[model samples]
Target: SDEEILEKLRSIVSVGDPKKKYTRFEKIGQGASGTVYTAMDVATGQEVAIRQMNLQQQPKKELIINEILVMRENKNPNIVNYLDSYLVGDELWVVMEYLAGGSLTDVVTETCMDEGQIAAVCRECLQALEFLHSNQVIHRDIKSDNILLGMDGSVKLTDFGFCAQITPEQSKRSTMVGTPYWMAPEVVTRKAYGPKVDIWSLGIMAIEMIEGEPPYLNENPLRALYLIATNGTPELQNPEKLSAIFRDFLNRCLEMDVEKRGSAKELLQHQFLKIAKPLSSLTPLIAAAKEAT
Candidate 1:
């Protein structure tokens, strides 16, 4: 089955340059792990994003394999569509659908988002988290920068570099990972944390969306970790900015104790989601596109 999937992926692009003919393209963004390029799919004549791993300090062999495995197994409209991945020379390339709207961070930087708009994006993200958690997958890293918006107002959860599969019996994590500002108190203390850590990140993201920055942004990184580990998240002010129902939804997410934090399923049924409709109509289109790619 894996071989068959790999074969299907190979058909879409070359081992390295899906379009061997092209040598130049637009550089979209870069990070420690990889750099993204906007290039044309020579075979289909459609736009696609090519994420090339640095492989300098980090040999991306395992990273690429894990990313492909996670992408192939998870299917959700709110998650970015993974097109293909292959190696050219020593570098590994990851292909994905080109989203023109860019990251949520970019959107927030340009202007403040209204409560309704923030709710829409938050609902989409929660739906994505629900899918992953239900399947026993933990998205260790959750932040606004990892959330991408499409031109049609669709939101997709991207970048699962730190995601891990969790079992019910294993409730704690020993390793320290994830961005400090969004990390949960349990994670900061090196306690074995479960899916609730992601809820904490979501809560931080919700606050950031409302205030234009995280609650602990002013503190030093180590001090921020200490605050998160001890004081928990700061209370959100200005309830008038968001609906009472939405405010309550965020309150439940920001809970300190992991056991008390609401599950993804419970959060989905909150009053805030009742006012927002899920995009069920796009499910078929997203599934079809993912399969085709």
Candidate 2:
């Protein structure tokens, strides 16, 4: 009797009730692939996000599977958590952790953040990136839109459709993925790339938080993408305006030579990150964004 009770108590379940546990609410977001709606977890009194997409589409099936695979494989505190998923007729209903604070885009739009708040966000993201890289997972897409914030002031890294898994024997990938502005030069050039590609985008996201946009955003899209590839090293409008250590942090991440770029673990130790405050410091900014919405 003791062994049986202990077995029940110690059981681990990664995925929960597939279809009946969530009460879908208002639609919150839409992207090229799917529409996401807010929801509540009936069993736990917690909020959740439900993404809906038609499985009839040919191009997105693999992406859907890829996203689920990556989400289920490596569950990290700094990353968005998946709760459950199932099909309804031809549509797939995927449930995940709900972040009512919205994306980092929202936070940057409504409030100007000092380096301490920005560094705190960066530290949270870097922790997720470090975990993914150590597991041979490349988050081919890393940008502000993919970064979410919780009502409790926690930062979460989401969106994994472009992610790819690297085997130990082959650590490099060559697929051209990610947004034009955030895409690394190596990815654009179709050169062999590894997890460091995400670091470049992470650098872009930091500037996005500071300057309100990535480099060359106002220029022609094609030209901007070209610049990311051909430019010697893109400089911020005036690097001196920002902290010296922050500028150096961006330089290391934006290094043209991928080999020269520091790994996520190394970047986590940057002087800029040393400026990070507690995650709780972001509460007011998130509340401001929520009010603005």
Candidate 3:
């Protein structure tokens, strides 16, 4: 059976020569699952992000399968694009759009954003969140590191490794998998959580954009973990810097009770977001950051 499977795999792999069809250039990212490289798709004459997952050691087909399922259903400009993927040898090759401007973290420190601009980024992310929630999927990871911006004027979400699929009968999860500082209390306590966790992370991100860091950035992981899990009401850390409207929105997001936290659709029409700008409004901000660098 192994020999027959290899025979079929060989035919698939042989359809296009690896050397000619694609070119691996530089490593762009890596984690426990795989190593990602900035590569060229010779077949389409396009630059793409490529990742090599070591199936030889751990056959994590579920990651690819889940990611593919999520990406396939929710195709939108607000979300990162998953182009193509292939299995060759013991490594699974995945391809995605090459976003050059990098993450929001790049701009957060070097630049100071106005309320409208910050709201714009929040609006885009929340829009993406609402879409995911309606589709019965939860992106457990939502932070500056995961939200990427492209030179072509795109601010989108990525990294679906911790993403979970929800069913109508059970629309929540209890697994505690997410980045520190940005994780919601409901998730941190290992209680049932849904897309609301993403909104809480977004609230943390709103502070990050204005202040250049998340609320618990200075705290060590263990200390911060204790606080987010147990802190009944989190502080805005210098609340005077932002407007009252924006503060109210952040308060709505950081609501300790999972039952009271605002949903993406509801927050989209909130008072603070009334000032949210168009997607193109971010171009000048990106350009300014480029100039600063």
The TM-scores, one per candidate, come to 0.83, 0.89, 0.86
Q: Find the candidate with the highest lDDT and give its number.
A: 2
Which is superior by lDDT, 2 or 3? Answer: 2
Q: TM-score-based ranking, best first?
A: 2, 3, 1
Question: Which residue pairs clash within candidate 1?
Answer: 14-18, 172-192, 173-192, 173-193
User: Local distance difference test, per candidate?
Assistant: 0.74, 0.82, 0.79
lDDT of 1 by residue, 2-97 (tens): 444345445544555555743447887886777889887776766788888644445434555666778778878899878777655445678787
Error of 2 at 21 (Å): 1.2
lDDT of 2 by residue, 1-293 (tens): 43342232223222334446777577877855778888888788888888877655535465666678678889999999877776554556778888878899888778888899999998899999999999989888899989999877899999887898999898888777788888888887877888998999999999889888888888887888888888846677867788889888888988988889988999888999988988888999999988997
Q: Global lDDT for candidate 1?
A: 0.74
Q: What is the lDDT of residue 53 in candidate 3?
A: 74
Q: What local lDDT does model 3 show for residue 133? A: 88
Model 2 ranges with Cα > 4 A deviation: 1-19, 30-32
Tell me how candidate 2 scores on lDDT. Answer: 0.82
